[PDB]
Amino acid sequence: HHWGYGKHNGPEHWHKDFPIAKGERQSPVDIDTHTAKYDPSLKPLSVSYDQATSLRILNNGHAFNVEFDDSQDKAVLKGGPLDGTYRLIQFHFHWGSLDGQGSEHTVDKKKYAAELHLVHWNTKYGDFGKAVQQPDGLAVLGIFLKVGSAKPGLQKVVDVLDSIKTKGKSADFTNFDPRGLLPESLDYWTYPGSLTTPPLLECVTWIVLKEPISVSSEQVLKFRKLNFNGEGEPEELMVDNWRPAQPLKNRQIKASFK
Template sequence: MFLELVLLGLLSTCTANTGVSEESEDQFKHWWHYCGIYGPEKWSTLRGKGLWKMCMDGKNQSPVDLQASRLIFDRTLDGLKFDGENELSGKIKNTGHHLQFETDTNSNRKFRVFGGPLDYSYTLTTIRLHFGNTSQRGSEHLVNGKAFPGEVQLMFFNNLYEDYNTARSKPNGLAVISIFTQLGNTTNTELDKLTSRSVLRELVYSDTFIPLSRMNVRELLPLTTDYITYQGSLTTPPCSETVIWMILNKPIYIEPDKFSLGLRELKTYRKENPEPNPLKGTMMNNFRPPFGLGNRILRTNIFMQENQDERCPVSKRVVVYKVNEGIMSPSNTRS
């Protein structure tokens, strides 16, 4: 495990700010990008009437840097619970911004999460990949200022609402489970379904998609019950501050060739479009820079018991995270 700590904790409560409604959103999905004059620093100015103003003015924006010194152990946080169907049908799509799996909204097969920091049940709608132009960066969230090669985000909507588009403008409307990707000799079997060369050859251009009949969500998740959670926002416009984030404390693995020979070859423009968009035509570095945590609290259920030190009976052990050549390893400190 690469995240372990002991800190006395307390609960956090945050008020969620809402974003723009869906009716005025879909037609502008190609307006924003990850660099240049349409990049994250400009998102708030790309729409009139301040419809994306939360991207700049929000106080609870995501992603954030997960600093060990800010982690608070909360003994009331249970492990996440899941129900519904393990295997879902849907489609794998190149959106021009991301490669993602979108569940079939007309299917009765659903995958839900509840428990932990969630007061309601949430239904999975999208599995989204973020990655960089090198393996030294790619994740949206950082750990002590260091990035992972990629980040897989499972996006859920609150079952109080009819669908994702309705829920994303509501307080606690969305929940996202985030998984870091780490380089390895083999690729997670379910991640391989999204990143195999045979699949990516069909998805080179924006707005292309292929069906996928069996995505086993449980097999995509790493074997851990530990996570970090905080109140945040969507990391794409309209940056609505309605998201409960849960970052799992184990990565899943992906072969380096999946990036160099596949994901980094995806295009951000349609095949029939003669001019590449401002991302210079290639999908990479599709991550938003991190924001300050502000007054928010990073809660965690990760606990490590240590034998009491006779010389310092109240000492506690904290694990500080270091990244060496893209591999996470803990080093112990005392306070």
């Protein structure tokens, strides 16, 4: 599979190799804030990242992933719309070539400069590969980035990017605290969806936070210096690695807040 984000292999082409691209619960979606319904049944959201153990950071040719030790319940997400325990496995971002685009989800058609995905899998399925074959296999916590003040908690990520410029490069990335990437408020929207890249599997409970985090222009500029290509190949800047909004179809977006 040679999927990417260019004119010739971008989101409009994915359906040929991955027919679920036109499925009934694809992501991302536009969140229409006037249609989303407060749901008093949602339990409180619990982000328990105090024992998180980061390991490594990898440029996989699509984004960069900060990987965690998920061999035990070290960093988990529970509550909200979720039944049981979801274990943090990795986070990554999607971002733009310009500050006015980059997010996958949109809010009343507003695009943010980037979107963070903290990826968790349902521990009742034993491993990540089994979990992605289930409709409730993953919980992705989505956080919007806007350009303004610097995010101090992001800077350790920004500073390692020089060492993973090209596809296939990795670096040791221990003792990184993902709590420094969260906004103050955990108010969220939730809906059932999919992975936003191939294989586009319909396995995700989305939890999208209302409150964006602010990052600096200098921080997001450093994201844009990464490369989609491997070392010694023609340079293609890693920008606009986002899928646009997909049809909502027969789904409801629920709000955790009034």
